[PDB]
Amino acid sequence: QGASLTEIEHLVQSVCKSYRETCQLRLEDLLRQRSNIFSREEVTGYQRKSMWEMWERCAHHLTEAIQYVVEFAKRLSGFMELCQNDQIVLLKAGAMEVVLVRMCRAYNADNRTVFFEGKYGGMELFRALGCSELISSIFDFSHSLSALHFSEDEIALYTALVLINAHRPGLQEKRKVEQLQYNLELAFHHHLCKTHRQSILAKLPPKGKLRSLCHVERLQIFQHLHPIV
């Protein structure tokens, strides 16, 4: 806590490692499946489903996704050293925000499609849910984040910062989180300088944009954290 520049580069590689081990689906794999688009008949099949079936499916995939985000935070340096309440507060407030950012990888801007259950489909795939403005907002955010051409390492380092934020209410050890955050900010800025990507900082979604689009229940976060005691 309060790291030197050599320590900061160990922290960049570390976060990038943790991300690669918990990225769920390989970027190469997602990119290669872009040609696999749902047929008009497959779309109709999803639209005919009850909102209850669709929610169950969506909830299953989001749960799976959140689990990979939880494993990502657990592998972050200093996260496991924080108290249990801070670990829960940080994950409860940020896990869905991280899933949304990570989802930009499964998004194809050419045809405005998202990878869902094995193929790519537009927002009409979610018609049954009855929440057009919400689905629209998610595709909008993904489309804006796609335009940035966000690298795997840029995502790893930015999502570490979405999670490790000392401004979350309910933090008991606020100063421990701040130290972690300051080291990750510098690790992010330093990596952007090494890769000549300083330009993306002004292009990133602003303060509150990720928060307005989005909190997980305290028990469902502890569940992902400690699945066996």
Ligand SMILES: CCS(=O)(=O)c1ccc(CC(=O)Nc2cc(-c3cccnc3OCc3ccc(C(=O)OC)cc3)cs2)cc1
């Ligand atoms: C992530 C890491 S990855 O490895 O890139 C990877 C990427 C994809 C997959 C496949 C997959 O799961 N696709 C999925 C897509 C969607 C989805 C997409 C767009 C709009 N809506 C969607 O769902 C509806 C919905 C309803 C309420 C909320 C909410 O809470 O409102 C804020 C959020 C979403 C859900 S699941 C696996 C791994």
